[PDB]
Amino acid sequence: WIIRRSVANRFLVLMGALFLSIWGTWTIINTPVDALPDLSDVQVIIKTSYPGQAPQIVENQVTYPLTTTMLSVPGAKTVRGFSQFGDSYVYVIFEDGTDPYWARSRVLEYLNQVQGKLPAGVSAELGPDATGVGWIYEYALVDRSGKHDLADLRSLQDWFLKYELKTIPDVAEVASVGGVVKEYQVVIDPQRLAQYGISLAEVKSALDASNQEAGGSSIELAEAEYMVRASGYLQTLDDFNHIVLKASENGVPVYLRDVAKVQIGPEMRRGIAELNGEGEVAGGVVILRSGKNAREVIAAVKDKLETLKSSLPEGVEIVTTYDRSQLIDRAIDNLSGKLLEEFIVVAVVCALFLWHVRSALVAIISLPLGLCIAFIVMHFQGLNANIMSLGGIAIAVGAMVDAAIVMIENAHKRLEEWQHQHPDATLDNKTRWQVITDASVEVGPALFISLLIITLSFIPIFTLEGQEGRLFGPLAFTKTYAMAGAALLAIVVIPILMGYWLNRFLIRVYHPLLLKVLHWPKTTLLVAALSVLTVLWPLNKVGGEFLPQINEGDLLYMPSTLPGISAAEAASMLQKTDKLIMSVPEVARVFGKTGKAETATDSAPLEMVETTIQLKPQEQWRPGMTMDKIIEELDNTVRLPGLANLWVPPIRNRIDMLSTGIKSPIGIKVSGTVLADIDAMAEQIEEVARTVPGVASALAERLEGGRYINVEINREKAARYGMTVADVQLFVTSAVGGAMVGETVEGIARYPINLRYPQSWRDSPQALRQLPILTPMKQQITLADVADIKVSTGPSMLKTENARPTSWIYIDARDRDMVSVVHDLQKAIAEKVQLKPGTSVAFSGQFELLERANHKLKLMVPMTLMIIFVLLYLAFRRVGEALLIISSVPFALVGGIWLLWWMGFHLSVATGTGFIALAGVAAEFGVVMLMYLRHAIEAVPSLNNPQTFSEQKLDEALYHGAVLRVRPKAMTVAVIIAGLLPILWGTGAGSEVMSRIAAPMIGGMITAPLLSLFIIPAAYKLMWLHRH
């Protein structure tokens, strides 16, 4: 069809080809390299720091009405709710097709409204333009020189590093983690307050105004501007010691020095950060924005650090703690190796059947330029892609051959038939030009359209939503590039190259076999149906999983414990477990951090601690230790009472936490309208989630286990001393507590200045009972005189998904399959856990992503047929044959399963795409079948036969169709299979998922050819016996 012209134009294709070469060799050099598909959904965050009162009211007014005001504005997948004591985090997460920034702008309008509602000095701070996946490069500042300390390092990181980094384009925000905030503390001795007769509020009201600079207008002298200033900012210690409180006519003043000592101490720490199970240090963490390039920014950071590896003060040392580069480059240096092993293997397969070296080159050339014609459009794509693109061309390059070889094989034979008559003396130009072009026009539209079929029958995958969408989508458009690109290139290449320049025992075993399949052919077709029931058995008991647990150069550690643990303790158990991890001789570093870091991204309760664990090079571990094997020497080593242990890959961890929460591989939700009810019906789900041998550890989080020390203030008792509630509360906020009052603006930097009694008067409830207070009328009573204070238990961290209470349960299980562990749970969860009136048991996490994935695959197989079924009426015209191909396909898939079972895999989504692939190639190999069967017959021998019935002529044309296939078949089933084998094995950086997809292909692509060698051929006859 439109192939005759491809041959006509020669110099253009040649020139174009070099153009593709220079461009291709400059696109593999002009492209962004990423590590993995960013499943990051467009997430909008809103950090609010309602003073430091209590969770409840934080959920009732600064949160709830905020979550719902945003649900209005569309786009949101789910509205999340974090109500942490002191900090209110609210999420609206957009999904699928939503402009990331449109989301922000459309959200922003509501923001200014809430800002006015917040107390003075607090803002809702819009979230980092990035996400948790911004988790890129982390580092800790250590100084084993003593020249400096944490307080010095924190101020060293927040006023230097955090700034020398934020300017690096595409970096979003740099967060500081773990450290001590220089805080000017003032310890008021309640006694001296009573002695000098000064009210607490008098101190603050005095302090408040004792720090500030005041300017003055430009006074004119010597005809030049003179700008008057006014000393004010606090700088020296005495400046604190000399706060004016009162003074008599005498001139004798009363400063602050004589009311309290002003010591510089640590500020209430958000979250702790530790290093190598020995000591704690200052930490920094860069956060790549949106879906920008992970590598580019990282590398851009290194040399910038080397610029500072001299500007840093003696003693300090930036020890990296986590770097994606050590993975991305480990995943690319593996994929490059596979693409190479492919090429050479395809180059040794073509040389096995095909004899000439010149003729083997056509299979070669079709690959490099095939890449050049791939990278070209890869750089044009709009969504970016990632590593997946590399694995895609690994499957695309295989297809290249099938389109290269069949056509080239059609050339070796069209020349032989022209030699049986012509002498072998004169190879004139005219004779060496018709034979070549003739082979291209035959296979032309015959196979060209075929690829358009295989690509389209693989299209639906593109329709996958959100995460998995832009995940397998890449590997989907890549196949098209090379493959579909060859339908225009490889077709015009082979002829050009062919025109510019143990093989006996191979065709033996096969032919004698056909004698039996053509004998009583109906039953041979029936035995094929026998195979299906033998494949159903292997199916079950292999469960499955959303995706292979891709192991990386490190791993994140997640220990969850009961409600509210003291920061002191929750920073000791941390620094403890770290010492434990270092026990194993394969771990390099251990950057343990509990609680949030200085970023609107990480919202971690002190309860748990996400520790980054870099392990030594695989070329250094113990003789017999693997990822899954080491994890055991961890989960059974790092063990503390009441600490339920869980281990997960860091990257996969972050994303799940952002997208749906959880991020303990297994997740169980429970909606609640009654606080006590929800946790109750959720608690028992934990004691039965352990009764399964497949589960390793589990931890159910309580919604209200926080312990309170209430101060129920008494209005009547208060007036007795002439105090309004406000007056007495002052002694709760910055007398027993210690909220800020101001900041010492030190040039570039600023530090807090808190105010309270010494710790003694706030040891225990009793201390708060004897808490000495100085009335406005100079009376000196105790806090007990204006209020009774009792300890109670209530909400610790209010969680509201959909603005409606809902809790999740974390579950660890990496010694089984992610289907039998989630199934058995669903089985038991409703066997001895009777439901309260209000609850919504929703299995979330990695299984909620499983549901969606399997719905797309089940909605992909029927509509696979329509594209497949219609394209059979286009190229073949026959109606019966279409029912032969659509029924041909089930057998190809039949085999694909058996390989997964043997090798040892599970039913994943990566495998399913491969399974769709098997049909597409098996649907093409079944087409090159119907072709030779519809060509040979009508070519010369048959035509005299169909007028009636016969058995000999039919016997011959079938013996010919067997021969015309062996060579193309062998080549095809050779290159592809020989190319699938490298990835098959499964070992390698990140290869764990790239093999899961390919493995299914092999098995199904070995049973397909053999079943298309006998079945498809000996099945056409029956339909012929219908057109009579």
């Binding site: 009573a194 643990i565 158990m573 503390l640 040891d763 004897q770 000196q780 009573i781 300890v791």
Partner: protein, 322 residues
Amino acid sequence: ASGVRIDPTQTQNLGVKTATVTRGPLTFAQSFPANVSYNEYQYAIVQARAAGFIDKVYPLTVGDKVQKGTPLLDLTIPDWVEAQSEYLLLRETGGTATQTEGILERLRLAGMPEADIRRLIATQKIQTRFTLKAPIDGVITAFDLRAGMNIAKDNVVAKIQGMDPVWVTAAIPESIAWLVKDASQFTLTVPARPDKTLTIRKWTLLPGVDAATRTLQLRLEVDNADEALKPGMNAWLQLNTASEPMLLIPSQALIDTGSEQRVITVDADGRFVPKRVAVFQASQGVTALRSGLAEGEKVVSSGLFLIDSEANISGALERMRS
């Protein structure tokens, strides 16, 4: 089987320090502010026992310190002239020895200082120049009589009050009084001079709870034989007060959840078992219990939380309650 066990090599990695049960008194501790008021038992106020006027006023004024028998004023009292003029008249002219005492006593009753009157018997001549000594050893106040003046019967020459066994009253909030039992014991501190160790002579709880400031009054007489504790100076008193003997475990080991209050008993073998207890009071660092644990039992005080977490999850915390 109540309680629950833990792999020792885990409680060995946690630290898990243990403290044993004791029975005895809980030692209440608290501090209070205090002024160094002058010792009011050494209150002296000089007044002329008769009228007259001033000749000389020595170099003194409110603020200075004066010792026993310091020269204050030099006044001339004219009321006692006739007394003497009539006395010597009889002394030089024989005069009955019975009559002599009569007029000489008529002076005492008039007011003349029994010493200035002795100056008379020693030299038989009228007395007109009187020097006012400082009755005791202390500090001056309200010295409101100066030179060129006429002194009267009520004109307070000098109000000299002492500062030895110096007083120090300490304030105590009304709703705390009970922290002061006779069986108590105090030790004061003074920031002015932290180099000197103060010794208390006698303390007494004044029966008058000051009205102005709703506080109790606690006076303290303390040795100041070197004049180191200036009257008016600040002083921090810290008291210790025994308590009716209860059972005591470190407060670092009692877990209160409002509803109930529990600790974690340890067994012979080591089966960590929660045990409900009734608290009585706490302070200084330890807490008492009106009942609950048997004296001798072992209690966990370190890393207790994670232990209770395991114990709660182990449901051992549920079986106990039943």
